[PDB]
Design a protein around this nucleic acid. Structure first.
Lengths: 272, 44, 90
RNA sequence: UCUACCCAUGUCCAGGGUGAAGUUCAGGUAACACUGAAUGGAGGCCCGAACCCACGCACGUUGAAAAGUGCGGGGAUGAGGU
RNA sequence: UGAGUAGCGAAAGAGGGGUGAGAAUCCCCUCCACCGAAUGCCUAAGGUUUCCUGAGGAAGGCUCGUCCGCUCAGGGUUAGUCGGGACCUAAGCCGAGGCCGAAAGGCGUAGGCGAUGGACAACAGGUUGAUAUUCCUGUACCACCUCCUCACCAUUUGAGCAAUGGGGGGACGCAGGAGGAUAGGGUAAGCGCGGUAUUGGAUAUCCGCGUCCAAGCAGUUAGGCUGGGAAAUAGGCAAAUCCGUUUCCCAAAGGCUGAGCUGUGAUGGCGAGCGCGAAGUUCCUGAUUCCACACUGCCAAGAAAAGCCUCUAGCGAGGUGAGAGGUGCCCGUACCGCAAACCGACACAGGUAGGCGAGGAGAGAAUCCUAAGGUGAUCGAGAGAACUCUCGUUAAGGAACUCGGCAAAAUGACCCCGUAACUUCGGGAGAAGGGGUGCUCUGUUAGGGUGCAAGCCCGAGAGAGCCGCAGUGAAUAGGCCCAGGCGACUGUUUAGCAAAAACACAGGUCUCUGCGAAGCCGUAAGGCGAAGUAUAGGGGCUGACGCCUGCCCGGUG
């Protein structure tokens, strides 16, 4: 589901987009929408704390069910929808009892299939189980840390994690980037692979399209002035004579770790 | 030549108004010293 | 609020003399009074049935005499249309 | 209240060109490729008024104006102006 | 002092009367001239009496002034329906308790405020010097009330009512092209009124003018959107007939919406024209408007809440429907609003958001002349030197000046014909560059639209002829070609010297970050990052695309 525009104008010279056969509808279910106004990188007091942001196309939030709390009720899925909040695509699945919900559409999901979420659910694409029931060596997504909080850890398009074995109160699971982690065995994850796997291969042709997405221009530190960036200044195009390359606020910004070294979670990260 | 001043009564009152001054702490001192000076037009 | 203080003065003008013939009268009334108690007051104090009342107010005209630049007092004018077959007023 | 950026909500862009993607037909092939018409209507597409910008020249320089006017210029469905 | 010098702020007035002490400048009249997608008509922000009438001319008016946006005395703005309030909410603001903080205070839950948005019932004629959907005229509509009237239900196997609680709706993006209808226009035919002229001719297919009417009420519709019924019910904090989800059955009806069109509204008004008042139809063309974000396509995936419908929980002895009679408050309402009333110190060649915005030719809101309508622009007249500025022509040569073809000149519209090297196959390309363009007849040409016809409108072509030097006879709408640096490109910047090779860019690469991510603002509460989760965010560097990106880790990190 990737197509190329033949270059007619100059802007479309290098361009790719994703045709939406995986999508099944265009109009969402009114009930689950929620308002959302874009902040544009401004803090509560109004100051700007996040460069390179603001000014996209206005979007409306669709509340997704990351918890999968409702257990035992057979869920039917009939849609696959586009959602401009995160790369992945979602599925509005309607339950036997009669209330509907949105779920991250996993790879290999099609309209009409069934869904289960109990702690004894069969293991297929779209089901959700507490990790203790999950068997070793099975791909999984939408993991969380504190049980009942809802999936946080594998949610973007085409992202997946692998379970490397259960050993007790916790479990060993290989997140994306391969940094295996120790996680509580009482947490509920969603089995499968996130179903927009081709999202990486997009080739945004126009600057205007990135601006539509809402990314402001980024100016190099080098072309700044001395007072407003540690790199700015110098006659002509100058190389950075500041040993380590540095950030706009003074710190070095190449090849050095940054996580406060005493934090508790570190003892679980270090499994590796 | 859209010049440096553009009149707008709503905004004039909303920023420099007596309510706006009285709301904050510093506005109270501004009114206090204006009254002490004895100015006729106390606030905008 | 006694009704007698609601109506301050009438107004004598060419247009007032006009409207007198077609049975519409002009009155300077209290600034705070609204379209209702003016009607009730004219009814009570003249004993005359009234059809409709229209109210309009002027700002205070600025004026200058000698060297001083004061402002004339604000005015709230009232127009009352009396019904047919009703008694007139002095 | 100018200006820079941002948020919420409205509003403006005469007219004419080019002709994308798909889709119908016919041929084509076991089937698929493909080939030709028709339809189609996309572009930070083209020419050009309103609008916006300010590249050249002249004048003005105790000026009509404490930054403009006159004649040419650039964008003009967009990262648009307001 | 400069010095009676500079300046007197883009512009067509001319003349005859009037007033008056005094007239280029004020009033009236007749021509002439200018704008006419505005210099016109409404209406914001804003100005705050400048608006109107009668008086005055010291100052203001770059002159004068009998004059007025100046002075003086009076006068002028009428709303249940227009805009805003007692209706709703976005951003943002405030914020009872609270969290934090040397103090002041910062943050923020409940909650409230907040239109630039949503919902919301009056319109077409008249009227004075100033107001008019407000005043008057005729017709209406909306919410609520009952001294009253009739039709009906039960006054607990309860009629009726309905929630600050659910559910449905309100409810939304951009572009494109059909269709339907209507503003609007043509005066084409017909009709009515007036006229037939003196400069050569014209009772003639001759000239001037006009040729309509709502809102509401009742029908109808281009159409658009909709499948419907039955049973059950792990859900929608409580209910469930409502919503949702299942299963069985019928498949067009019925339903919702709908520009507009019909009648009435109109026995009335308006209406060319001398208080009265004729005709008032049809045809042709036809939207930038409405059906309508209706349909199609697209991806960048496109507010909330209350008005409104419905479900019960609940109240319930008096109510429902329709008449009849009543009630309906506050603020704005004058005038300018592309200008001399606003912002620029000025009666300033600047700027000022919206709605309407005609005709001839035309693709057009361009172009030039004109309509309604407005204006003749606040110093003049008379000489017609230099010099300066803005323009028009120049024999011959033609870029020889020049830093540089700076400037100026030249092309320009439409229809036919041909278009190269290179190319990322789109382009290059309107390449280059040739031919035609008027008028008459063959013609109310083939043919097409419109309509039953009559008629009206669109008009590919050719073949004959007629003119002038010149036929897109004016206004206005590419100069072109060859090469080369730099930058892929559209875009952005030093408001007010420098718009570029600088910035950005999509693309690439390195590195950080496992989510109370990192990074960042703040002391901290709080946040943004993000109601996002390594196909995601932050940072450094390079900048489409094609081929590539070698060696050194001794030093600094």
């Amino acid at each position: 589901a990737i197509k190329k525009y033949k270059p007619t104008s100059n802007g479309r010279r290098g361009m790719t987009t994703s045709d939406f056969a995986e999508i099944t509808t265009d109009k969402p279910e009114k009930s689950l929408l929620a308002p959302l106004h874009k902040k544009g990188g401004r803090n509560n007091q109004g100051k700007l704390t996040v460069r390179h942001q603001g000014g996209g196309h206005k979007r409306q939030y669709r509340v997704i069910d990351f918890k999968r709390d409702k257990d035992g009720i057979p869920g039917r899925v009939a849609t696959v929808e586009y959602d401009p909040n995160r790369s992945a695509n979602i599925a509005l699945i309607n339950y036997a009892d009669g209330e509907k919900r949105y779920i991250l559409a996993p790879k290999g999901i099609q309209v009409g299939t069934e869904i289960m979420s109990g702690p004894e659910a069969d293991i297929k694409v779209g089901n959700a189980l507490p990790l203790i029931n999950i068997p070793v060596g099975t791909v999984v997504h939408n993991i969380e840390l504190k049980p009942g909080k809802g999936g946080q850890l594998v949610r973007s398009a085409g992202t997946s994690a692998q379970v490397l074995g259960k050993e007790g109160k916790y479990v060993l699971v290989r997140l994306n980037s391969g940094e295996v982690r120790m996680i509580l065995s009482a947490c509920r994850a969603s089995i499968g692979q996130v179903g927009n796997e081709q999202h990486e291969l997009i080739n945004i042709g126009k600057a205007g399209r990135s601006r539509w997405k809402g990314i402001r221009p980024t100016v190099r530190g080098s072309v700044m002035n001395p007072n407003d960036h540690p790199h700015g200044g110098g006659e002509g195009r100058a190389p950075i004579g500041r040993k380590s390359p540095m950030s706009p606020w003074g710190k070095p910004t190449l090849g050095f770790k940054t996580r406060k070294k005493k934090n508790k979670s570190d003892k679980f990260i270090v499994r590796r | 030549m859209k010049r440096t001043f553009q009149p707008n009564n709503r905004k004039r009152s909303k920023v420099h108004g007596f309510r706006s001054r009285m709301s904050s702490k510093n506005g109270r001192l501004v009114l206090a010293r204006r009254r002490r000076k004895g100015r006729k037009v106390l606030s905008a | 609020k006694d009704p007698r203080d609601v109506l301050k003065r009438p107004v004598i003008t060419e247009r007032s003399a006009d409207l007198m013939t077609e049975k519409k009268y002009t009155f300077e009334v209290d600034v705070r009074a609204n379209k209702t108690e003016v009607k009730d007051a004219v009814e009570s104090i003249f004993g005359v049935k009234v059809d409709k009342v229209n109210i309009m107010n002027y700002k205070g005209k600025s004026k200058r005499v000698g060297r001083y630049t004061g402002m004339t007092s604000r005015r709230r004018k009232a127009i009352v249309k009396l019904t047919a077959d009703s008694k007139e007023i002095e």
